[PDB]
Write a protein that binds this ligand. Sequence first.
Ligand SMILES: Cc1cc2nc3c(=O)[nH]c(=O)nc-3n(C[C@H](O)[C@H](O)[C@H](O)COP(=O)(O)OP(=O)(O)OC[C@H]3O[C@@H](n4cnc5c(N)ncnc54)[C@H](O)[C@@H]3O)c2cc1C
Length: 241
Amino acid sequence: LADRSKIYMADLESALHYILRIEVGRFPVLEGQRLVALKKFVAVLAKYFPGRPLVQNFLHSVNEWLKRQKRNKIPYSFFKTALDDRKEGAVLAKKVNWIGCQGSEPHFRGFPCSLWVLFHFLTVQAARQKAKEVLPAIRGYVHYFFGCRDCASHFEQMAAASMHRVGSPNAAVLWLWSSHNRVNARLAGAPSEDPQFPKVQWPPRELCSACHNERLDVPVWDVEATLNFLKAHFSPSNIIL
Ligand SMILES: Cc1cc2nc3c(=O)[nH]c(=O)nc-3n(C[C@H](O)[C@H](O)[C@H](O)COP(=O)(O)OP(=O)(O)OC[C@H]3O[C@@H](n4cnc5c(N)ncnc54)[C@H](O)[C@@H]3O)c2cc1C
């Protein structure tokens, strides 16, 4: 019975944990563009993740450690040691804990849900203002580290198709939002859909009524109202600690 209108810090910190210990850990060696993508994304986290003091200090420490590695190749084992030295387990957690991303069954929702939330939050933080590097950094992360390539593939299809049209932080926020809805549409009512959390064109009317237009002559979404709702929804004040 989580509040669909809130953001739970637990989902965000679990996402970070999963990213650093699981997704990045799938590669014995981090090099080339994958390493560049990791550094750009961590730089984005260090600056835009809405973390508590200990977590923000942790991200800055990891960010700086990465910036110092002059080498072109970084063994994951070496990165794991850096995480351990910076007590990520104490700062974040040992096991994931989903609240707003809790699937009705283990295989439903979870990390993928937390990743979307994290991504949207990063775009909004950048718009309540490097900033221009948020969406590319997110694209970079999805391409080089995101587990389910099925999930990834569909995201990259959208990026090349239009991510290049994004010319501002606000546009980037809306781009990710609408791109997420295009994914929602294809997944709606699918055999893989969590029955307890049906896919819909988000935000639904009960969440944001002004975001929705009435005429079949005017667009479905009120882009201005939607932008404001997004800035309000993905904000530090809307996070439950
Ligand atoms: C880049 C990317 C590509 C993916 N591609 C696929 C794929 O091709 N196939 C497949 O099976 N799975 C894919 N997934 C997974 C999928 O999108 C879901 O994350 C998953 O099915 C869990 O769905 P969910 O219902 O819990 O909510 P999610 O879609 O994970 O949503 C997280 C939450 O964010 C909010 N939200 C919903 N829509 C929006 C929106 N438009 N804008 C802002 N916030 C929103 C809601 O509060 C919701 O509970 C992908 C994930 C990512 C991050």
